[PDB]
Ligand binder design. Structure first.
Ligand code: MN
Ligand code: MN
Ligand code: MN
Length: 391
């Protein structure tokens, strides 16, 4: 292998400007990094700048450098949707025609009607809400009627809440499995069904750790599958295992925040493995993008960039670091949905003794998967063009 270890970091939702098909998605004008940089009166990201971020695209506080540490370009998404599953699936070698849907006004009546009809239970709520607001609002009614509280988020989720002393857990998991079948339907395609059991009394409801998720497998065997089947390590950090429903994962490390994700990245640098270490930094999407909070997003980007020198210090001559994103989520854009954007790509190894150069624009995210597969000598994905020999 040219590289013994590859460290792939998805900065979740960190877009670098409107894609050529943004108009189809109502995403004209979008620019996640750009708008944040203007809000911050200059983003302070000196380490991403040293890698070549401003060589991809100059933005406020983010300038090009003469000798970038590694190679740089951007990537265009080929898949139909702009959700997290689509983007990640494409990164690992797939093409996804059928988008996952989001439900800001609630789920369609036809779906909720069929869930009632299969379960024998009435549904209440049916809107985007936090766990806390929805339980305050409807927890008491739920307790008194046996009804199911159905809510959503700004992401592709269907969440079903019920009190553990009113709806037994096993019954709630059965209900979520029925909902998971009903939502494999392109009219209603949700990424994840989540059981949200709770306990307590009105005024004091708490969600319990008995949460269970019902995800879809990727629509194809990914590069991760091929790695795992060839006895490589595939270390998933953060939401990566959930995103691929475990497919192809040999070890999974839960994280609680972006700093904790960078700590687990560092833990993997200290491991003797051969294969892929794959990190998702989700806070950018979950806390700041969907909440349309440019200040919080800005601070988080700065906090991330400050962790990078330690990663540079630990990379070996036969390691490769890849940094990208899975879509945009511009915190100064209408609504609460993602944005259809190009994503940055940075590729760095300390064996790059002269620094890097510009790569041709990657016409699918699957170029990353193709690179990884070529590096490790495993079956090449159906989609994607490796840039391994360009490095
Ligand atoms: Mn939009
Ligand atoms: Mn995402
Ligand atoms: Mn999201």
């Amino acid at each position: 292998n040219k590289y013994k270890r590859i460290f792939l970091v998805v900065m979740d939702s960190v877009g670098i400007g409107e894609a050529p098909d943004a108009e189809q998605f109502g995403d004209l004008g979008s620019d996640t990094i750009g708008h944040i940089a203007e809000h911050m009166n200059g983003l302070q990201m000196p380490n991403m700048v040293k890698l070549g971020l401003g060589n991809i695209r100059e933005m406020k506080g983010i300038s090009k450098v003469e000798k970038p540490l590694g190679y740089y370009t951007k990537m265009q998404e080929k898949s139909t949707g702009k959700d997290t599953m689509t983007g990640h699936w494409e990164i690992m070698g797939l093409y996804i025609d059928t988008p996952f849907q989001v439900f800001p006004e609630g789920f369609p009546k036809e779906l909720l009607d069929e869930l009632e009809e299969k379960t024998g239970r009435k549904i209440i709520g049916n809107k985007p809400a936090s766990g806390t607001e929805i339980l305050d609002e409807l927890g008491q009614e739920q307790m008194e009627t046996g009804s199911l509280i159905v809510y959503t988020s700004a992401d592709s989720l269907l969440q079903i809440a019920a009190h553990e002393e009113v709806v037994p857990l096993d019954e709630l998991y059965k209900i979520c499995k029925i909902a998971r079948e009903l939502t494999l339907d392109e009219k209603y395609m949700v990424g994840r069904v989540i059981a949200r059991p709770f306990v307590g009394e009105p005024g004091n409801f708490t969600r319990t750790p008995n949460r269970h998720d019902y995800a879809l497998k990727p629509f194809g065997r990914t590069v991760m599958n091929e790695l795992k089947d060839s006895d490589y390590d595939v270390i998933a950090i953060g939401k990566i295992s959930d995103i691929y429903d475990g497919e192809g994962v040999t070890e999974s490390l839960r994280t609680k925040s972006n700093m904790d994700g960078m700590d687990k990245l560092v833990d993997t640098l200290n491991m003797d493995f051969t294969g892929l270490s794959f990190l998702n930094l989700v806070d950018f999407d979950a806390l700041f993008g969907h909440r349309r909070d440019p200040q919080g997003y800005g601070e988080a980007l700065q906090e991330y960039d400050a962790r990078l020198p330690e990663v540079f210090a630990k990379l070996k001559e036969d390691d490769l670091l890849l940094i990208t994103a899975d879509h945009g989520n511009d915190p100064i854009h209408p609504g609460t949905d993602h944005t259809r954007e190009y994503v940055p790509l940075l590729a760095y190894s300390p064996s790059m003794k002269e620094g890097g150069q510009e790569l041709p624009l990657r016409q699918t995210f699957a170029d990353i998967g193709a690179t990884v597969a070529e590096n490790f000598g495993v079956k090449m994905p159906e989609y994607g063009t490796s840039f391994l020999n360009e490095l």
